[PDB]
């Protein structure tokens, strides 16, 4: 059970750990990593220039899937 | 009455309808909330506001003890 690190790059590619994901494949990836434990914390980080519209699309996808424990990581 | 912190594309920021800056946001917030750090701060931003700006605001809030954040789109 490794920490879940979701990152969004400036070109809007996304990763869980080193595993590439998109908004359409992210939940399948998370569910495999967490064994469906929705109480897992999702630690989210993004490049400085990633915008609020992009962040909210990711947050909405996590939210609708029942991932309700989200930490935003700053540098 | 929920507290809404808004950040616009041009970097202007508001608590409710009242404008603030990064250096004045906490004193305004504390005056509004009676210093109750359990108040949820609702955050909304223009679509183009970037993560670096969001994190600066979140850090100012966190250092002041406001831990409960709700992001609205």
């Amino acid at each position: 059970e490794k920490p879940v690190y979701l990152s969004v790059k400036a070109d809007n590619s996304m990763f869980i750990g080193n595993d590439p994901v998109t908004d359409e494949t992210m939940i399948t990836a998370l569910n495999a990593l967490t064994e469906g434990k929705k109480d897992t914390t999702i630690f989210f980080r993004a490049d400085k220039t990633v915008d609020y519209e992009t962040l909210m699309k990711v947050m909405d996808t996590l939210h609708q899937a029942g991932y309700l424990k989200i930490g935003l990581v700053g540098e | 009455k929920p507290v809404y912190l808004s950040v616009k594309a041009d970097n202007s920021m508001f608590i409710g309808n009242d404008p603030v800056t990064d250096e004045t946001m906490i004193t305004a917030l504390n005056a509004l909330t009676e210093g109750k750090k359990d108040t949820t701060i609702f955050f909304r931003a223009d679509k183009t506001v970037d993560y670096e700006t969001l994190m600066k605001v979140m850090d100012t809030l966190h250092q002041a003890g406001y831990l409960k954040i709700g992001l609205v789109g």
Binding site: M59, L72 | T40, D59, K68, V72
Partner: peptide
């Protein structure tokens, strides 16, 4: 409709 988050920094 809000998404509850925390801020995590080193």
């Amino acid at each position: 409709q809000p998404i509850s988050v925390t801020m995590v920094t080193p």
